[PDB]
Every structure is written in C-alpha cells, then in structure tokens.
Amino acid sequence: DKKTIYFICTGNSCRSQMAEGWGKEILGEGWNVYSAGIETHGVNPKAIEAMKEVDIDISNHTSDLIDNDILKQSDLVVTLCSDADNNLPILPPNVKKEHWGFDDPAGKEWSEFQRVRDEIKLAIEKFKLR
Ligand SMILES: [Cl-]
Ligand SMILES: [K+]
8 A cells, every 4th residue: 555765865874864754754654765875874963963853753764775675666766866866776667766856964054954854844745745
C-alpha cells in the first residue's frame, strides 16, 4: 500500500537527513521514507539541531550507503545535491527520478541551515499535495 521515496545526497549527512526527517513527518501515512548517499560522512550534529528547533527528532537516523534493494523498489528517487545524480546507476522504468536542488549549508551561517531546512519542508509539502 505505502509507496517508497528515497532522498539521495553524497554523504547522507545534512540535506538528505533533513529530507528524511521532514518526509517521515509529512509523508509518513502513505510513504516509506529513506535517505542515502554514494559514500557516508556521518549524521552532522548541526542537521540534528536544525530539525530539533522545529520539533523533529532525527537523532536516531543513520548515515547510510545507497542500498540496491531499496533503490530498485523505490517509487521516487529524489536527488538533492549537485553530484548525487552523477553517482546513480541507470534506474528501471518503475522508478521515477527527480532533482530538487538545495544549497549546501555546510560551514555556513545558522540562518542558512534554517533556510535550507525550511525550503526542504516546503518542497515535501508541495509533493504531498500533487
Ligand atoms: Cl546529505
Ligand atoms: K539514512
């Protein structure tokens, strides 16, 4: 019954972790939500803190490599970063792919972490109402 959305960004540390957090909160009733990257850089504490400000707990999340099994049965794969698409294999027709680009908040102002977090929320809300 539930469909599957896969948020992809190299590192699975910041943008994709926020997407997974918002995805579970907003899309949870009709979607299984996952996030991954071609390589793992660890869940950034600033991403955990950014989600904590808006009452979303992402402290139990893990920084995961892309899983072949989850990828093949995904209804929608969403790349969120500049090099994420280049690091994906050819996806079969049952899997849809979209690019929702967001700026990298790594090493930037706190207002930028908040902006990117909120832009991701807006994109996921727009997705739910398609
Ligand atoms: Cl990320
Ligand atoms: K993850």
